[PDB]
Structure formats: C-alpha cells, structure tokens
Amino acid sequence: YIKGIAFDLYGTLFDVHSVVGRCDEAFPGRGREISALWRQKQLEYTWLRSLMNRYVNFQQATEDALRFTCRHLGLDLDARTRSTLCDAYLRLAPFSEVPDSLRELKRRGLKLAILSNGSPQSIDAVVSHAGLRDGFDHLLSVDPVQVYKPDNRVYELAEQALGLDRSAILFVSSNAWDATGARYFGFPTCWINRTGNVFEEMGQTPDWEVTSLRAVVELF
Amino acid sequence: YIKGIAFDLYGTLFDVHSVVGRCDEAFPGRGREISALWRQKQLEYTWLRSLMNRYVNFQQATEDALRFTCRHLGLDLDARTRSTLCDAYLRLAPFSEVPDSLRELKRRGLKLAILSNGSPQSIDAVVSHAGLRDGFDHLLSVDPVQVYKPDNRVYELAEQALGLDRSAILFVSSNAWDATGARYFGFPTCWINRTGNVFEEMGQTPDWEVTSLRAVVELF
C-alpha cells in the first residue's frame, strides 16, 4: 500500500534535547528551563501566527520564541548569545536508530521525504550536518505555502512532491498533534512514542504506535 | 474615540484559579498541576482544531483537555469526577475590582460586551452566577463562526454586534496572545497585566498595559 514516507524533523528524527547543553553553558542551571519554554513558544507562535494570517519564517519564530523565554525568566540575552544558541538547532543530533533505520528503509525502495516547519535553510543544515542528506528524496519546507501545520495546505505539498496519493504515503511523527492533523487529512499514521506519552484528545488515533524508527522498518 | 469595550472572559474578568480548589479536593496535592495542564490543553485544542478546520464547541474541548491531563498524569478520572470538575468553570469568581469597575464603566454610557471562546451556555452561566448579567450589553460566543481566536472571523462578530467600527472598540484582555491578534485586526488594545508577565514576541504591542480593571475605568 505504502510507497512513500513523510517524516517530521524536530523530535522525530533529530533530538531537540541537543540544545539543552548549549543553553545551559550560557545560563548555568537554567539550561533545561530555557529549552522547555523555547519549544513550547516556537510551536505556539507558528500556530497563532498562522491563525492570525501573519506569517514569518521559522528562523524568525525560533528567534522570537527565545527572546520571550529569556525575558520571561529574567535572563539577559545579548545579541551574540542569541545567534549561537539559535545556531544550535542547525546542528541537532539524530536518535541512535535513525541513521541505520533510514538506510534499510531506502534499501526497500520506498520514497523518503521530510515535511518540516523549518526553513529549507534549516532543514538542509541539520540533515547535511548529520550526513543524512544522501538518504532523503525530498526536503519539504512549509515556507512556500506561507502557513504552518496542522494546516492542510502543508500536508498537500507532501502529496504533490512525492507524486503519490496520501493513501500511499505513511506519515511518521513524534508530535501527536501533527499525527492528528495528518490522519484527518488522510495519511496512514505512525506515532513514534519513545517517552511513553499519551495521545492528544482531539478525536483521532494513529494507525500505528511504536517506540522507535526500528519498528517502522519492520512494518515492511 | 471609544464608545464600546470587548472583554475576554477567562482570566480577564473571572479567575481560572477558582478551579484549583475543586481539582485538588478530587486529586489531593495534584490540584494545582491538573489545572495548569488543563488550561494549556484547552487553548492548544481550540487553536489546533481551528487550523485543522475540525471544530467542536468549547464545552467539548474543555472535557477533552481534562481527559488528557488526567491520563497524562496517570490520574484516574471517572465519569462523575469529570462532570463536577468541568462544572467548576460555570461558577468562576470575578476578580475583586471587576464588579465595581464594570458598574462605573457602564455609568459612563459605554457599551460593554464579552467576546469569549466559551459556548453561549457557559458565558451566561458564569456571568449570571456572579450576578453580572445586568452589566453587559452583549454576550458574544465564537460558536456561530465555528472557529476560535485569534482568527479574525471572531473579532468581526464584536464589530458587528456592537454596531461600531473596530476603532471605537477598546479590546481588553489578560491573554497577551489574544491582544496581539486584536491589535492586528485593528482594535485599540489594553493588556491587563496583574502577574507582571511580559508580552508575547509576535510583533505587536498593546496600546495600554495596566494591572487591573481599575486603570481601565480611569482611562475615561
């Protein structure tokens, strides 16, 4: 049935927790608090700006979300500390299974794509950094449609770039809110649950719940 | 310039913290954790469901947000405990200044309205409960437009029900994310900052920042 796979980037293939280290060495002890508030602010800004029809690229939203987090925690964030800390995302590390799981996936002749909210500038940066560029067929950014997920205009891009119907495209995501929208759109959905989280209560259920990409490779 | 005022309900005129008590007497010690996660889940569900174009009334979203919160904290939430705890919102208490501030406001002949996300069922319940029904001209729900804030289709309702241009309507809100959307829409905005929070980093700034409704009454 499936001939392609649309992956999320942050949290699904690459660990966001990689930022904590660089956040802590700038604001000692506070490094874990700055990141937890950073990611929630990012997500909330992309969703709200979309609803307000006031779009700005992901790089902009990530910078604004940090500026708020630091100001909210009373932390003093100068210009330079803002750049290197935002530069941290462009160097995330993939979860241990990812590299080998992707390799065996492509070996089965399936089309692999990344449907991420990050700018095409960011997407290529983290993927190439991990040396995983030679593994994906398409690196899809939401920038063109000028709106963020879970807006359906985003999910279509994946259906158009892969040249396959949504029914032949497996949607893989760690974020249960994205897997809810994708399922509504029509994609068969696989939720990656490494931390034993519970699904969102927005009326949907993923077709598959797994603990790592290892299980995705075994679905074939 | 201003001839009318559009108020938010939860957090602006009525205290959400009123729920903590009834939450704690059902799950002792955990009462403050269940509420903090409840409100964030409510907001996130209204925003996401809007973007997914999958609307359900506020009463539904408040019930789903609790079902998740409890399941996320491992708490066992039976049928009855879900009803009385959700019934808690229909009995919130207004901040001390609210009752008198609203009275002196109407005395100045300004039109007062509530533009809330809650169902018209909820809005009238909490307002009448506090005996504040005789103080508002219109009780606007988002239910008709089938979408939640900060979507502009919501802000228009206020401009249409009051029969005034957005420039003659003061938008009062405690939630800085709502005051950002309203300002974009065109309303003069007053942010109620009682907890000394910092504004969102979504490109906007309210026209007025105050600590209570007392300052709003003095703007006239």
Side-chain angles (χ1 to χ4, degrees), chain A residues 2-16 18-79 81-102 104-220, chain B residues 2-16 18-79 81-102 104-220:
Chain A
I2 286 69
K3 297 289 176 297
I5 304 174
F7 292 111
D8 262 28
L9 192 63
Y10 309 111
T12 307
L13 301 171
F14 297 77
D15 201 8
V16 183
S18 300
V19 179
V20 176
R22 316 304 171 286
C23 274
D24 200 273
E25 67 176 77
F27 306 108
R30 292 289 217 150
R32 269 131 286 225
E33 299 177 67
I34 292 174
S35 304
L37 184 60
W38 198 1
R39 222 295 165 107
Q40 268 302 130
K41 252 51 261 292
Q42 279 187 350
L43 288 183
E44 289 169 17
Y45 284 7
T46 62
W47 303 335
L48 292 175
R49 268 185 176 287
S50 281
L51 280 169
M52 297 189 300
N53 198 35
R54 284 298 194 300
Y55 176 95
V56 297
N57 50 126
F58 196 58
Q59 303 178 262
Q60 180 73 319
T62 301
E63 179 182 11
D64 295 333
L66 184 51
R67 187 179 305 137
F68 171 90
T69 291
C70 285
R71 283 214 308 140
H72 171 258
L73 296 178
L75 276 305
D76 295 39
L77 181 72
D78 54 281
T81 301
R82 185 165 58 233
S83 288
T84 51
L85 191 47
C86 276
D87 249 41
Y89 273 97
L90 316 175
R91 286 167 291 219
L92 301 186
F95 296 92
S96 51
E97 87 276 23
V98 174
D100 236 315
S101 290
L102 290 186
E104 262 59 82
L105 237 29
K106 184 170 186 174
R107 265 49 185 167
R108 277 179 178 68
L110 299 159
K111 288 188 180 64
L112 307 172
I114 286 182
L115 173 55
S116 185
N117 272 218
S119 65
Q121 268 60 73
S122 291
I123 304 188
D124 179 77
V126 323
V127 172
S128 287
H129 161 258
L132 293 166
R133 183 59 195 103
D134 282 39
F136 300 102
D137 300 77
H138 322 265
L139 295 180
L140 304 175
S141 167
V142 303
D143 192 60
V145 293
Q146 293 229 298
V147 68
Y148 293 102
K149 309 175 188 174
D151 189 79
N152 279 215
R153 292 200 286 290
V154 177
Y155 300 137
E156 233 290 67
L157 284 167
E159 188 175 44
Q160 295 185 338
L162 289 175
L164 291 160
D165 191 47
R166 64 194 65 168
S167 51
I169 296 180
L170 185 63
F171 188 77
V172 175
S173 190
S174 284
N175 286 18
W177 60 254
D178 203 22
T180 288
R183 229 292 190 118
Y184 271 140
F185 182 78
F187 291 121
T189 307
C190 182
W191 184 39
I192 299 290
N193 195 14
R194 299 171 175 115
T195 310
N197 291 312
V198 279
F199 213 55
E200 303 285 11
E201 294 295 311
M202 287 188 289
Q204 198 64 262
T205 53
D207 297 285
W208 299 284
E209 185 185 345
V210 303
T211 63
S212 60
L213 225 169
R214 279 173 284 249
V216 182
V217 182
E218 284 154 26
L219 251 38
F220 306 105
Chain B
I2 286 69
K3 297 289 176 297
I5 304 174
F7 292 111
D8 262 28
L9 192 63
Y10 309 111
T12 307
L13 301 171
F14 297 77
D15 201 8
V16 183
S18 300
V19 179
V20 176
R22 316 304 171 286
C23 274
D24 200 273
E25 67 176 77
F27 306 108
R30 292 289 217 150
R32 269 131 286 225
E33 299 177 67
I34 292 174
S35 304
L37 184 60
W38 198 1
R39 222 295 165 107
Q40 268 302 130
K41 252 51 261 292
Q42 279 187 350
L43 288 183
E44 289 169 17
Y45 284 7
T46 62
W47 303 335
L48 292 175
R49 268 185 176 287
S50 281
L51 280 169
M52 297 189 300
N53 198 35
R54 284 298 194 300
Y55 176 95
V56 297
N57 50 126
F58 196 58
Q59 303 178 262
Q60 180 73 319
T62 301
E63 179 182 11
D64 295 333
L66 184 51
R67 187 179 305 137
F68 171 90
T69 291
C70 285
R71 283 214 308 140
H72 171 258
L73 296 178
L75 276 305
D76 295 39
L77 181 72
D78 54 281
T81 301
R82 185 165 58 233
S83 288
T84 51
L85 191 47
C86 276
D87 249 41
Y89 273 97
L90 316 175
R91 286 167 291 219
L92 301 186
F95 296 92
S96 51
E97 87 276 23
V98 174
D100 236 315
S101 290
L102 290 186
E104 262 59 82
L105 237 29
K106 184 170 186 174
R107 265 49 185 167
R108 277 179 178 68
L110 299 159
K111 288 188 180 64
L112 307 172
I114 286 182
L115 173 55
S116 185
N117 272 218
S119 65
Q121 268 60 73
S122 291
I123 304 188
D124 179 77
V126 323
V127 172
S128 287
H129 161 258
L132 293 166
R133 183 59 195 103
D134 282 39
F136 300 102
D137 300 77
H138 322 265
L139 295 180
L140 304 175
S141 167
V142 303
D143 192 60
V145 293
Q146 293 229 298
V147 68
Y148 293 102
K149 309 175 188 174
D151 189 79
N152 279 215
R153 292 200 286 290
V154 177
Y155 300 137
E156 233 290 67
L157 284 167
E159 188 175 44
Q160 295 185 338
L162 289 175
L164 291 160
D165 191 47
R166 64 194 65 168
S167 51
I169 296 180
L170 185 63
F171 188 77
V172 175
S173 190
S174 284
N175 286 18
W177 60 254
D178 203 22
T180 288
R183 229 292 190 118
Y184 271 140
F185 182 78
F187 291 121
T189 307
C190 182
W191 184 39
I192 299 290
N193 195 14
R194 299 171 175 115
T195 310
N197 291 312
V198 279
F199 213 55
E200 303 285 11
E201 294 295 311
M202 287 188 289
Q204 198 64 262
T205 53
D207 297 285
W208 299 284
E209 185 185 345
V210 303
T211 63
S212 60
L213 225 169
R214 279 173 284 249
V216 182
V217 182
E218 284 154 26
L219 251 38
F220 306 105

